[PDB]
Amino acid sequence: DQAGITGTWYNQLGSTFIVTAGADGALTGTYESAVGNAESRYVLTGRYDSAPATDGSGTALGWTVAWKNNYRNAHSATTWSGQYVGGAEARINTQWLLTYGTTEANAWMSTLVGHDTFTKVK
Amino acid sequence: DQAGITGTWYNQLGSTFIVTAGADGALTGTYESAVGNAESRYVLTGRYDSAPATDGSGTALGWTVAWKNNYRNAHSATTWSGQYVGGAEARINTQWLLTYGTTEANAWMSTLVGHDTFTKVK
Amino acid sequence: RDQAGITGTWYNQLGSTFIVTAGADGALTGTYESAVGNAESRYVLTGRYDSAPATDGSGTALGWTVAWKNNYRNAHSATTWSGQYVGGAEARINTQWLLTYGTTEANAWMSTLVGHDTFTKVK
Amino acid sequence: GRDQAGITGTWYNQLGSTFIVTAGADGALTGTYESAVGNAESRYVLTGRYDSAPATDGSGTALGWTVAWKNNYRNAHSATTWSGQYVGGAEARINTQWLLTYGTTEANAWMSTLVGHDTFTKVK
Numbered sequence A, B: 001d002q003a004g005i006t007g008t009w010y011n012q013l014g015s016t017f018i019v020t021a022g023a024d025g026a027l028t029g030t031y032e033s034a035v036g037n038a039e040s041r042y043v044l045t046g047r048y049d050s051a052p053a054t055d056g057s058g059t060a061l062g063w064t065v066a067w068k069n070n071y072r073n074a075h076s077a078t079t080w081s082g083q084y085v086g087g088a089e090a091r092i093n094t095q096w097l098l099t100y101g102t103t104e105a106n107a108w109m110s111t112l113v114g115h116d117t118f119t120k121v122k
Numbered sequence C: 001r002d003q004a005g006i007t008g009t010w011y012n013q014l015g016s017t018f019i020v021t022a023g024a025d026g027a028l029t030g031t032y033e034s035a036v037g038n039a040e041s042r043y044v045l046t047g048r049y050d051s052a053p054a055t056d057g058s059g060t061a062l063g064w065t066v067a068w069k070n071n072y073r074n075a076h077s078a079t080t081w082s083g084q085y086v087g088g089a090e091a092r093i094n095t096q097w098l099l100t101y102g103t104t105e106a107n108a109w110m111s112t113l114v115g116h117d118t119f120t121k122v123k
Numbered sequence D: 001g002r003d004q005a006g007i008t009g010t011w012y013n014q015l016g017s018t019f020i021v022t023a024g025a026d027g028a029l030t031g032t033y034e035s036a037v038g039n040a041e042s043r044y045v046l047t048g049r050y051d052s053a054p055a056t057d058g059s060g061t062a063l064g065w066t067v068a069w070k071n072n073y074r075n076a077h078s079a080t081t082w083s084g085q086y087v088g089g090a091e092a093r094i095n096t097q098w099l100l101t102y103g104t105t106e107a108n109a110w111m112s113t114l115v116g117h118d119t120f121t122k123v124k
């Protein structure tokens, strides 16, 4: 699985997800969002299942982007939770949560939920 | 900031969240869950907003546990998204997604959602 | 307004059947037939939509609840879908859903699934 | 219905919002919702369902309901759905996660839904 997951992915919004997987269970790389308060690439870090089930089940993985880089700071972070699905139509299917910083009065409105699909198709 | 986040946190389930924060925004550490297909400590990694807003809002952050250990492999990953609230009694408020590896037929049932609040006292 | 647009029979990606009638002032009523899970046949659904939506190209907010009891079985669970109706050439209802099942207190942490369903008038 | 009388009544969550509901013997939830925060004033219609024959075996009673945020004063072009369980006992509780969706353009649909969680008890 380490082969398939490593590389460059794109989601349904046009965002670019560059990731290296290491055989211990680590995800590293960068994220460029096509939408939102975001410009250029952002450090991403995460983990995946190093020894996944060989019966057809996807490989569970997740990663986090804190939306601060050398250009702008959106005071938020997104975590993607999902699974990688091999086969020729190699896909990474996620649900995500995006939290931005708030006062305590506004905390009830701090988190967005959504879902992305990535493939390696430019 | 890093002094504030770094340390040992416990959520409402009794889980143990050991995290180190770097100047760059990095999060690293170990997570011990008191419930679930989990045993002993799992590797975690994430990110946090290195330079939060100046209006008294919380610090955005998130992290991912892949639930493979030397002892247990639950074929799942959890991502936590939320914010660090500093003050006399510091708090991390989060929402999390837990995805487990499925076939494509059962993908619709692959992701639990919940909310965790971590404090510095058990 | 979108009363007629929403009203009808809709199908999601799973193959579930969503039969809904939208009333004059924002009521949703009808039945849901899941193609998956611990479910047989039609279940009662109720919901609300925004009966006076913006007209600035934005979707129409809605949501509804199914409890997974009918006369054939009881899955001790409810799902809520929250979403928007998008009109036009091919109408679509785009949703995210929360499925909660009964649990003890110490198992509450694992009570709720989340997912996304897209309904069209096809398949 | 089992918990048809416990569920029924006037609840409050952690934000101070007010949840006034009536359960029917076979599953229906009807009532009004008055949010303490957000783009809302006064009461909004709500409808939902609950499991009227719950396992009387440790488990909570699964339920869910919806508010569209339009009434005679405001229209916030959004809807919230709560799903969760009623837990009876000495402190009856309703613990929920919620999804709030608001009308968006197609290019902005990605940002259309907030998730959160509300705890209701029958004490102001």
Ligand SMILES: O=C(CCCC[C@@H]1SC[C@@H]2NC(=O)N[C@@H]21)NCCNCc1cc2c(cn1)OCCC2
Binding pocket: A011, A013, A015, A033, A034, A035, A036, A037, A038, A067, A074, A076, A078, A096, A098, A100, A114, A116, D110
């Ligand atoms: O936009 C970003 C950066 C990343 C977005 C990209 C996601 S990540 C998941 C998805 N997938 C993908 O590729 N891109 C997208 N941070 C803004 C969050 N919001 C701050 C805020 C504050 C207030 C508001 C509203 N909002 O109103 C109330 C007052 C204050």
Ligand SMILES: O=C(CCCC[C@@H]1SC[C@@H]2NC(=O)N[C@@H]21)NCCNCc1cc2c(cn1)OCCC2
Binding pocket: B011, B013, B015, B016, B032, B033, B034, B035, B036, B037, B038, B067, B074, B075, B076, B078, B096, B098, B100, B114, B116, C109
């Ligand atoms: O248990 C875990 C990881 C432990 C983390 C606990 C969370 S993490 C968030 C929260 N916060 C905290 O501290 N602990 C808790 N992985 C197993 C997930 N379940 C897989 C599965 C498969 C099937 C099912 C049901 N489930 O039924 C259908 C058939 C297949």
Ligand SMILES: O=C(CCCC[C@@H]1SC[C@@H]2NC(=O)N[C@@H]21)NCCNCc1cc2c(cn1)OCCC2
Binding pocket: B108, C012, C014, C016, C033, C034, C035, C036, C037, C038, C039, C068, C075, C076, C077, C079, C097, C099, C101, C110, C115, C117
């Ligand atoms: O299956 C159903 C009813 C139908 C749902 C259809 C959804 S609704 C959203 C989506 N959209 C669509 O059309 N159909 C799907 N209720 C689940 C009850 N499960 C109880 C339970 C206990 C344990 C488990 C796992 N489960 O493991 C962990 C431990 C114990």
Ligand SMILES: O=C(CCCC[C@@H]1SC[C@@H]2NC(=O)N[C@@H]21)NCCNCc1cc2c(cn1)OCCC2
Binding pocket: A108, D013, D015, D017, D035, D036, D037, D038, D039, D040, D069, D076, D077, D078, D080, D098, D100, D101, D102, D116, D118
């Ligand atoms: O607020 C409401 C209704 C009241 C909700 C009360 C909730 S209900 C759940 C919770 N529980 C509880 O008691 N009160 C709270 N409608 C706002 C819809 N949003 C419009 C919008 C558009 C854009 C934004 C941001 N917002 O970003 C900027 C760009 C576009």
Ligand SMILES: [Br-]
Binding pocket: A037
């Ligand atoms: Br923003």
Ligand SMILES: [Br-]
Binding pocket: B037
């Ligand atoms: Br499990």
Ligand SMILES: [Br-]
Binding pocket: C037, C038
């Ligand atoms: Br089941």
Ligand SMILES: [Br-]
Binding pocket: D039
């Ligand atoms: Br608003």
Ligand SMILES: [Cl-]
Binding pocket: none
């Ligand atoms: Cl106001």
Ligand SMILES: [Mn+2]
Binding pocket: A109
């Ligand atoms: Mn808002």
Ligand SMILES: [Mn+2]
Binding pocket: none
């Ligand atoms: Mn189930």
Ligand SMILES: [Mn+2]
Binding pocket: C110
């Ligand atoms: Mn599980």
Ligand SMILES: [Mn+2]
Binding pocket: D111
């Ligand atoms: Mn936003």
